Amino acid sequence: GSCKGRCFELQEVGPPDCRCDNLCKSYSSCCHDFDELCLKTARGWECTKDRCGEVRNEENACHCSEDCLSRGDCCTNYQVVCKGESHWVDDDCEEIKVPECPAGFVRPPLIIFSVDGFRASYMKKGSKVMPNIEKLRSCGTHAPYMRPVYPTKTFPNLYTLATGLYPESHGIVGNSMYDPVFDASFHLRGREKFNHRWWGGQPLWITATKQGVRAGTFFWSVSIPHERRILTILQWLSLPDNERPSVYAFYSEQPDFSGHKYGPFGPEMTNPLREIDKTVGQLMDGLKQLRLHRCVNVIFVGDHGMEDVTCDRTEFLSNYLTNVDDITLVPGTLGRIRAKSINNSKYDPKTIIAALTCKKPDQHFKPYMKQHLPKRLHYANNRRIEDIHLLVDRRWHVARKPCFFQGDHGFDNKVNSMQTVFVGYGPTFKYRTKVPPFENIELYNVMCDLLGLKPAPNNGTHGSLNHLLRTNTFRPTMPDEVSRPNYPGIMYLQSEFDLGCTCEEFNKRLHTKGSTKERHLLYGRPAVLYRTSYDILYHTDFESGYSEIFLMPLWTSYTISKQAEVSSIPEHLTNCVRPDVRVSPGFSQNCLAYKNDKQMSYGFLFPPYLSSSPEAKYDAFLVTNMVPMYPAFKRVWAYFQRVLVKKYASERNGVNVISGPIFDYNYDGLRDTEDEIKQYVEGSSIPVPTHYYSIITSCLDFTQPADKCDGPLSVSSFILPHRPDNDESCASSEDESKWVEELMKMHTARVRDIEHLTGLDFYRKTSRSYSEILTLKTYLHTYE
Ligand SMILES: CC(C)CCC[C@@H](C)[C@H]1CC[C@H]2[C@@H]3[C@H](O)C=C4C[C@@H](O)CC[C@]4(C)[C@H]3CC[C@]12C
Ligand SMILES: *[C@@H]1O[C@H](CO)[C@@H](O[C@@H]2O[C@H](CO)[C@@H](O)[C@H](O)[C@H]2NC(C)=O)[C@H](O)[C@H]1NC(C)=O
Ligand SMILES: [Ca+2]
Ligand code: NA
Ligand code: NA
Ligand SMILES: [Zn+2]
Ligand SMILES: [Zn+2]
């Protein structure tokens, strides 16, 4: 019952007996002599010349004795001070072609060095402020920035890093949360967070253990100083082969702690950043002492950034609501609202939202029902996410009712100040290599590959980060189609239709297989990865995949050149809908349903505004090009089609557009089955989409047009909520030029998001490698 020879022991002793592990303080369960034996601090963390070849005094924090290297408990500068070696940072970058591990090591170990609140722009402070970090970044592989998950808080992002899962899937939806099934609350401070019931998914340390790879204890009690954490990892690395872990993690509270007090760009932040870099230097010096500097893979990673936030920029819910005592708020850089007491007829969340919507001219938050939040946030499918959510403007706070802190974080994850860091260094990482920015959900697959592990099912796209690594244990393969398209010719007469709406004989080559494929399907046909029956429909200006089940297109593909002219809908074609002779009356929509539904109207996927001729314009009014649209939504859609597509074509030297409907009534981010569709157009089997997407593709080399592109592609995409009002847009009374683009930028998306929501697979026939295509699919156009 003591810590004699057990300090930071990898085994965890069960109750009641006392412990000597990393987290014994966090449970208040350490042995009587834990601080005496394990938290040694005498004579600091640095050897001095007078200590060289000293006899071991066991009261010292670290050692300068000739027995220390074998134990791994030397001070990190021992060989520099006592053996005339250089610091790691003073050595030049040398390419690590293969791992160079000492005897015993069957694989390169992984060191995860996670720094709290390390904003991406701090990297610009350079080798002046952070020599060690700048060497890792220069010599190794790095991105401009890494995107965190929403909310951009500590716990959701640390656990996302460990699982590859979105917060809604792993369950840690915030630093604070209530679970109605448990009827308990989780808090950053306190003992409740230690209970396993909160934590879903499978984090890296469990994935490792289950596949026979030993993991160090990832988490450190705040009492343990940063130098003690580094020495502990160095001692663990000196263990026998059967006791030694292959994966470790260091966590730092800085620069987050100091960012909170002083804000992100204070002159006070230089000191935190120097301390962090000094600590990195101690690790890299320590690894060099053990001849592990060209063996271990190191990941320098942050959980989120930091924004300027002060007490004077606080919105109060009592300035909007008359009954803030009947509701519970998770306050701060985000809002989550809940009823105070259960069983309250007075509490209607739809009236609360209405009361919080566009009420002051300069209002610095926006309310949402969680299912109406942008889909890119993936913040809805969990019982711990409150129905009512407030997205708060950058630099602001929200509190319930009416300084020491100048910084905070937790805002929308595409906000520039919330972006964080990634650096990879070691044998498996590439040498002096810059990679495009990526999302922290992708890192778990990378870390599994660095340890030879099969990842558990997660939300990363395995293969999308292969370009970070020298050698790739995982080769992504493209999934096969589950459903082959039908290609119906002309079958029925126009006389034999009766769809209830007023509006070829000379043209034999009408709607035939010609150059439609080459003009309008630039990257091959989208593959349907679920079981359904659908038809391919060719036209002069566009191709489409028409679902016979949902009675509309799943996708519509067209290519607008830079020089394309916009035209108007003629007065005679304004209420025009033609039947499609290639599709049966049974599998077609009818106009009668849209007359019966007073709320609902219709729009077109391929725009009649962009048609190539007066002849070809008639193809846009086919019933197979038609989809259900609320009048409110048609303001947005008509503006996109008539104005914005041309604008993008003009800006990007032509664009290829792929547009279509999404059904996600259970808000899980996944394609709905027909059972889960909860709304249809009045008295018919035509389903109502929850969202509409478009994918806008062009050549990254803008000097080449979109239809003659040799090299990489550039993409931007959106998933627009299909809502009966424009209450989300506070300026929707003004001209569409003052608010529709802002709405679309808020609802930007990855092509991967649209694939989960549609069951489609895009970009199947290109000249690019599949790996490069997976990176293109995971890209988000942020507009920052
Ligand atoms: C100083 C404090 C902030 C550190 C507290 C760390 C705390 C969040 C950690 C400690 C133990 C962790 C659990 C443990 O590793 C095992 C599992 C099994 C795995 O399948 C799910 C995760 C879970 C429950 C860990 C969650 C995080 C815990 C509680
Ligand atoms: C994120 O990944 C998880 C795990 O792959 C997905 O959740 C799974 O969803 C399937 C299908 O609904 C279920 O069979 C499993 O029970 C879920 N597993 C876990 C561990 O959650 C989730 O759908 C993914 N999210 C997105 C948006 O694609
Ligand atoms: Ca769904
Ligand atoms: Na109508
Ligand atoms: Na409005
Ligand atoms: Zn944090
Ligand atoms: Zn913080």
Is the omega angle on the peptide bond into residue 479 within 30 degrees of 0, that is, cis? no
Tokens, residue 16: 């009641």
Tokens, residue 743: 């709405």
Three-point CA angle 418, 420, 421, nearest 5°: 170
CB 415 within 8 A of CB 405: no
CB 341 within 8 A of CB 325: no
Beta carbons within 10 angstroms of residue 133's beta carbon? 26
DSSP three-state, residue 447? helix
Tell me which residue has its CA closest to atom 16 in ligand 1: 196
Active site residues per annotation? 154
Q: What is the 149 CA–ligand 7 centroid distance (Å)?
A: 14
Ligand nearest to the CA of 157: 6
Closest ligand 1 atom to the C-alpha of 155?
8
Q: What is the 743 CA–ligand 5 centroid distance (Å)?
A: 11
d(CA 434, CA 144): 8
3-state secondary structure 385-431: CCCEEEEECCCCEEECCCCCCCEECCCCCCCHHHCECEEEECCCECC
Beta carbons within 10 angstroms of residue 165's beta carbon? 26
Given strand 433-434, what is the order of strands in its sheet? 247-255, 110-116, 297-302, 422-425, 141-142, 433-434
Residue 96's alpha-carbon distances to 49, 134, 191, 247, 290, in angstroms, are 33, 17, 44, 20, 17
Tokens, residue 607: 């725009």
The helix (run of H) or strand (run of E) holding residue 746 is: helix 740-746
- Residue 457 CB–ligand 2 contact under 6 Å: yes
Closest ligand 1 atom to the C-alpha of 202?
20
Tokens, residue 643: 């104005």
- Residue 366 neighbours by CB under 8 Å, 6+ apart: 357, 390, 391, 728
Q: What is the 409 CA–ligand 7 centroid distance (Å)?
A: 6
Tell me which residue has its CA closest to atom 7 in ligand 1: 194
Output the known binding site for 1-hexadecanoyl-sn-glycero-3-phosphate: 154, 175, 256, 409
Choosing from 165, 444, 530, 761 the residue with most ligand 2 atoms within 8 A of its CB, the one to mutate for a pocket test is 165
d(CA 315, CA 317): 7
d(CA 535, CA 587): 11
Breaks (C-N over 2.5 A) in the chain follow: 402, 503
DSSP three-state, residue 627? strand
CB 244 within 8 A of CB 215: no
Closest ligand 2 atom to the C-alpha of 753?
27
d(CA 728, CA 746): 10
Decide yes or no: CATH 1.10.1740.10 for domain 40-85.
no
Q: What is the 756 CA–ligand 3 centroid distance (Å)?
A: 9
Q: What is the 252 CA–ligand 6 centroid distance (Å)?
A: 9
d(CA 672, CA 532): 13
Closest ligand 1 atom to the C-alpha of 194?
29
Tokens, residue 384: 């711990």
Closest ligand 2 atom to the C-alpha of 200?
20
d(CA 456, CA 206): 10
Q: What is the 474 CA–ligand 1 centroid distance (Å)?
A: 28
What is the distance, to the nearest Å, from the Cα of residue 378 to the centroid of all Cα atoms in its chain? 8
DSSP state of 565: P
Domain boundaries, the chain: 1-39, 40-85, 86-474, 475-784
Three-point CA angle 642, 646, 647, nearest 5°: 110
d(CA 449, CA 430): 14
Facing residues of 425 across strands?
Answer: 298
Tokens, residue 702: 């803008």
Q: What is the 722 CA–ligand 4 centroid distance (Å)?
A: 16
Tell me which residue has its CA closest to atom 2 in ligand 1: 221
Choosing from 157, 199, 217 the residue with most ligand 1 atoms within 8 A of its CB, the one to mutate for a pocket test is 199
Choosing from 24, 160, 176, 194 the residue with most ligand 1 atoms within 8 A of its CB, the one to mutate for a pocket test is 194
d(CA 191, CA 626): 56
Output the known binding site for Ca(2+): 664, 666, 668, 670, 672
Tell me which residue has its CA closest to atom 24 in ligand 1: 196
- Residue 756 CB–ligand 2 contact under 6 Å: yes
- Residue 318 neighbours by CB under 8 Å, 6+ apart: 324, 400, 401, 402
Q: Number of helices (H) and strands (E) in the chain: give both, helices first.
A: 20, 29
Ligand nearest to the CA of 220: 1
Q: What is the 780 CA–ligand 3 centroid distance (Å)?
A: 21
DSSP three-state, residue 147? strand
- Tell me which residues have their CB closer than 6 angstroms to ligand 1: 23, 26, 193-194, 196, 199, 202-203, 206, 219, 221-222
d(CA 738, CA 729): 10
Tell me which residue has its CA closest to atom 14 in ligand 2: 457
Task: Give the CA dihedral 268, 271, 276, 280, nearest 10 degrees.
Answer: 150
Beta carbons within 10 angstroms of residue 734's beta carbon? 10
- Residue 643 CB–ligand 2 contact under 6 Å: no
The helix (run of H) or strand (run of E) holding residue 82 is: helix 78-82
CB 296 within 8 A of CB 111: yes
User: What is the maximum span of the chain, computed from C-alpha positions, in angstroms?
Assistant: 104
Tell me which residue has its CA closest to atom 1 in ligand 2: 459
Choosing from 207, 454, 459, 691 the residue with most ligand 2 atoms within 8 A of its CB, the one to mutate for a pocket test is 459
d(CA 272, CA 31): 32
d(CA 223, CA 254): 14
| DSSP H helices in 507-657 | 516-520, 591-596, 631-639, 645-652
Instruction: Give 80's Cβ-side CA count (13 Å radius).
Output: 18
- Residue 267 neighbours by CB under 8 Å, 6+ apart: none
- Residue 169 CB–ligand 2 contact under 6 Å: yes
Task: Give the method of determination.
Answer: X-ray
d(CA 415, CA 324): 29
Domain 475-784: which topology?
Extracellular Endonuclease; Chain A (3.40.570)
167 phi and psi angles, rounded to 5 deg: -45, -40
Output the known binding site: 116, 154, 175, 256, 260, 303-304, 409, 664, 666, 668, 670, 672
| DSSP H helices in 140-217 | 154-163, 167-170, 204-210
d(CA 247, CA 521): 46
The architecture that CATH gives domain 86-474 is 3-Layer(aba) Sandwich (3.40)
